[PDB]
């Protein structure tokens, strides 16, 4: 069947070079248009799409910034992004039929062009001297630059909120709406080394 | 009490649905599906490959179903066309309607078009065996076989520019892609091909009647007929014979491959010749100069003899067609090429129907028992072509998808393009190379055994 | 580049029908794909020509002529509130619009403020951190040190499996230093006809 085996996550630096690929298999990969897509947390751009024995052809906004390729002596459709900044987004590589102009099969490839790479700082964020029946507790995970895995341990009544930039790293909150309050602890799951799991005291 | 004048304009007149509803269908269902109709040229492929061979499968076995049809209080002929036209024109409506469905358009093509050919081999089969009943004398029965053809070669023209002149008059918006990429309506042309088609349906109806009112049938009673099932060992006695199988091969092939330039022809005008609002007036202008052109070459052949007559218009496109393939699409020089390719479309669906008497008296002298070498012939010719035109369309709509043409488009690749040409310059031209090549061995060798065989024929 | 514009990005939907609209700046001939993505994922095709389907279960239709396109969902199941896109193969610069689906819920938000705790004071910081766990629909929050204040970042999930409901976290960051205006208060304003005001001093 067709499908486009897209890379994985590119970390580049303000300012560097990004070469995404697709492996592009299950169909001749020189008889289609083979695009790209461009979506960060919003609806689906258009960068440019490229005939693997022909031309390319660039969106206007992406003339200078994007540069496709395609290797056919590996069914390889590529993606090379220059400056960046904002570029920090969900590429796809969805081809072409060759009479319609849709999409059929899509890929997806996470690039995010920041900087730094920090452990998570973990606040245990309390109740400030009330209570009324069930209370929620809260938990702040502050200063990391990657996925975490926030987990609490057997209570299954968690909200935890996606994370935001802070200047340069990220931040994330987790609620919990506990009604009995015997002991309670925040466990994070950032993968880096950084497994800090602290207790929620009172006050 | 002969054949009136009247009677066989009204049998002629009858004829001209057939002509018109082929022309229409094999000048402009590629167009319509492919662009109108919004379908994918694989499904494209398979309704033009399966409808043209579901004509020519239904030929055989009509053509047996009416040899068995008893005498009734109206004829043996005329309960078909008349219970047959209805749902015919109904099929042929259905044909140019695009519905609106979530998937299986081409479930319904298919099935419209396959039943349409089905209900037309119903009209035409009578219609072509009524010959034989409207008159015992085999003078009458010339006579109103060629009304009929003149009234057919009317009927090819008036089809070919009313659908032309309809469905071209209304344009849509094209579709731009990549390969673009540095108020008229897509209902308007849906509308458009329906009033055609209506305006089809109508003449359709109005023949029919004049069909059925203006020819009567005597009866007849098999006063002569025979049972005739020898149907395999008649095409086996063809096939042996020299001559005839070779006169079946050239003529087959050079209508193959013009069958060929007039399913891919509009796709050429169109993405090749830039003509995307003026290719119905080359359609017109092509068989206008056929018209013209049947004096021409029925000069051409008592003038100058059958055997280079034959030869020089089946190899008088082959300039042309190469030239519309190597000239950056010039406005004259494709209404030049027009007029040529008119001129050998007459020759090439012409002169063999004048080769065909001198095979048919040879026949006669080599075999003395013949019944229905003329009529085998046909019905051969007629499956083969009907058949391998379906497969050319279809191998040919099938390499467009391959090729990556764009539905609708207003320009296509580099590889459909080529395509195109090799389809209109390449293909015909090597088809008719060998149905050139098989008509050189051609041992009547034209007058100079033929009288020999009429005094033969003077003999027995 | 053709504007392709779905007006509604939200649209409320639980099981008995869904028409999302897609509207086209320019006359795109019929030429309207529809794709749905559901999160994590990347975008699948459902509609072509704006008519037909592919390979989908039957009770995502689409209709649309000229300039005014519409797919209808009329069983809408757990699988089918996911993203929706319209995008144009008229012209050569493809465009697309944007949409989603939701549930149905009642109304009702809760707040709950929470100060800095001892730890982050220590390493010289000071959040504030406001909790929104359950309402339905929009909300806005507000946060006054005795003065409205317009530093704070905040966050929304998405939708609840179970309670349907959204969520919702502020954050104040406010340095040691600048942490002596009086009392902290975080106001919500959901559809209750009343802010929800909870205060820290
Ligand atoms: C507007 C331009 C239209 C067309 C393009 C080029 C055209 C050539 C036009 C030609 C004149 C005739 C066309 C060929 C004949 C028509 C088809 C045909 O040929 O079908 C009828 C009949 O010719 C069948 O032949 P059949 O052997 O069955 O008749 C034997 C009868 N009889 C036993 C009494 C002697
Ligand atoms: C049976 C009677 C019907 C007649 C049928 C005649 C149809 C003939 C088909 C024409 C083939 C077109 O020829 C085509 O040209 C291009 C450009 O050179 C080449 O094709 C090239 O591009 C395609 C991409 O689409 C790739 O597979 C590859 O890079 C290469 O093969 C091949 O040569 C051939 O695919
Ligand atoms: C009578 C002749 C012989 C009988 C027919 C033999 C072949 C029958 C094919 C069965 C399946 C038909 O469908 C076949 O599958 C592929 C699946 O990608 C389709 O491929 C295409 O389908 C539609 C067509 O626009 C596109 O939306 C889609 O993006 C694309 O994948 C083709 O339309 C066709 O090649
Ligand atoms: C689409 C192409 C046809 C366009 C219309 C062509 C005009 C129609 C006339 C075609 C036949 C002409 O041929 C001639 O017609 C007339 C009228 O029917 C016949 O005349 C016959 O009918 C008329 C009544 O209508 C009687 O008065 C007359 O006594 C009788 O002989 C002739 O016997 C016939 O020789
Ligand atoms: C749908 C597309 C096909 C359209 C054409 C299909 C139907 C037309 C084929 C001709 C059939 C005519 O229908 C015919 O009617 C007469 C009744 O008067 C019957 O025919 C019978 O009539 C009498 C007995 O009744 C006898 O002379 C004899 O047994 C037979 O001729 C049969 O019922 C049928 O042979
Ligand atoms: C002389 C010739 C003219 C005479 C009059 C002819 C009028 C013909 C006009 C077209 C009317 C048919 O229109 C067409 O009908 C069928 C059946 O309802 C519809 O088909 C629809 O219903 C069927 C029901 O099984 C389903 O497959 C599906 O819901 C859909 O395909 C088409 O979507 C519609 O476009
Ligand atoms: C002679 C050789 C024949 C070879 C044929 C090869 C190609 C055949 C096309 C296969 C797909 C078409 O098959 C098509 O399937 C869909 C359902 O899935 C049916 O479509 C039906 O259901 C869908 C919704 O699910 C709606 O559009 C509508 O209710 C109805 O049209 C069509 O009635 C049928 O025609
Ligand atoms: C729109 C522009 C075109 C308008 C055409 C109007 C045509 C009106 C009727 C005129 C028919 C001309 O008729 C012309 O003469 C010869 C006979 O000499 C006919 O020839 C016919 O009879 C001879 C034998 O008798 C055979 O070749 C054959 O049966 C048949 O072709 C042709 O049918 C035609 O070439
Ligand atoms: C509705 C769709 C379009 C329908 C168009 C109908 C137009 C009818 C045109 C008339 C065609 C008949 O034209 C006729 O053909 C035959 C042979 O071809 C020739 O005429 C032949 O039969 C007549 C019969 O009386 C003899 O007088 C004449 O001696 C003989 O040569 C002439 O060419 C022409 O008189
Ligand atoms: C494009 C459609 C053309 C329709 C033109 C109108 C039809 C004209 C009829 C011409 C038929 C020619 O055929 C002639 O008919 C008359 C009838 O009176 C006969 O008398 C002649 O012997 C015959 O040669
Ligand atoms: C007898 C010869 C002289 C006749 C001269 C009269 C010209 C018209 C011939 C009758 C043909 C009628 O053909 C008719 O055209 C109209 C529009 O074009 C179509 O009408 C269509 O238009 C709308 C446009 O929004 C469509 O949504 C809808 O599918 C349908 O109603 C009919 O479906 C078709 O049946
Ligand atoms: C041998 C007999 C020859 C008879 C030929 C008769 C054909 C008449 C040619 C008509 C020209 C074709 O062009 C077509 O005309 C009709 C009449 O306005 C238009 O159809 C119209 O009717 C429909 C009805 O719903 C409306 O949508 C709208 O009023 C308009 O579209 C088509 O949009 C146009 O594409
Ligand atoms: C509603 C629109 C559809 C109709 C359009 C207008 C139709 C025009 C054609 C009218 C029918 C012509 O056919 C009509 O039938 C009778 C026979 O039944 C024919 O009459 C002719 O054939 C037979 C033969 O023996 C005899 O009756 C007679 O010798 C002869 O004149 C006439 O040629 C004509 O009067």
Redesign the pocket.
Known sequence: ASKLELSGPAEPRGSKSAQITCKAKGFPEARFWVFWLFQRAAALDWPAANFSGGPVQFESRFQGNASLKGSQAQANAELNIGALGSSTATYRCGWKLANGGFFPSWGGANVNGAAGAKAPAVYPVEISGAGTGSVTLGCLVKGYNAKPNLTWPGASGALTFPSELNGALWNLASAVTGSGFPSATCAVGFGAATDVDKKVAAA | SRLSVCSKLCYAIGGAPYQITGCAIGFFLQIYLLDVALLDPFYASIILFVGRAWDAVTDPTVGFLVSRTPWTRFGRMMPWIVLSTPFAVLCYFLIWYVPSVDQGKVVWYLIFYCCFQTLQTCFHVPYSALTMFISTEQKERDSATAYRMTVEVLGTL?GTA?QG??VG??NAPCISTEIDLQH?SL???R??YM??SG?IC??YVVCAVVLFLGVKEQKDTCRVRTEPMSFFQGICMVMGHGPYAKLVMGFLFTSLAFMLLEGNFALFCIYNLGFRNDFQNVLLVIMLSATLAIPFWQWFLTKFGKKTAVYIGTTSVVPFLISVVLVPSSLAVTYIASFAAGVSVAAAFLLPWSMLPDVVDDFKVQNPESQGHEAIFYSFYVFFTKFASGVSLGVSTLSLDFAGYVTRGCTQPGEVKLTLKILVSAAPIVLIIIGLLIFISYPINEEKRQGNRKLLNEQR | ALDINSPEAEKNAKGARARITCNAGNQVGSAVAWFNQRPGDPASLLTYWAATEKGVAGKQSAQGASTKFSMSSAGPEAPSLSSYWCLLFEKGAFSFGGSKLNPREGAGPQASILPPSADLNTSGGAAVVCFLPNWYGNITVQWKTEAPQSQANMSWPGQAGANAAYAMAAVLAITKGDYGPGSFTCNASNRGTGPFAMSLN
């Open positions: 008036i009313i002149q309809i008059m209304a008229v209902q308007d042309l509308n458009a009033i055609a305006v109508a003449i």
